[PDB]
Each structure stands twice: as C-alpha cells, then as structure tokens.
Symmetry: C2
Subunit: 44 residues, 2 copies
C-alpha cells in the first residue's frame, strides 16, 4: 500500500529549483522527489 | 512566500523509514522532508 505525502512551508525559490531539477531529469516533481527520497532511505 | 508540495504513492515501507528518520532527529516528517528537499536543491 501507499499514501500521498504533503510537505508544508516550501519557499517559492526552493519549489522552482526542485521543479527545474525534475524537468532536467524529464520527470514530474512528484516522481523526481519520490526517487530521491528512495535513494536517501536506501543508504545508512 | 510558501507552497504545498504533494508526493503521490509513497510506499508504506519507505514512509515508515522516513517517519523513523524524522523522529530520530526530533523533527516532524514535514520539517525533516523540507530539510532533505533543501539538500537536493543545493547540490551541483
């Protein structure tokens, strides 16, 4: 099973930087963030 | 100025791992993920 996760108080500048990084990898913001969080969780 | 981010279909296994990491650092999941998003955005 799975759930939608909401991150509050993301500053405008930060959100635009993340959207640019997602687009550079030719991904949705959600897909990009999911993949990075999965990489973070996989390392000690 | 601030914005909501939505991450869809975070698998339970991964969400449990993130919640544990946030709690270990005495942070809300949202504040922990805001810190990680800022690290992602910062790197070359």
């Amino acid at each position: 099973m799975s759930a939608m996760v909401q991150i509050r108080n993301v500053p405008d500048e930060l959100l635009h930087e993340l959207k640019a990084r997602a687009a550079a990898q030719r991904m949705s913001l959600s897909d990009f963030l999911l993949a990075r969080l999965a990489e973070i969780a996989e390392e000690p």
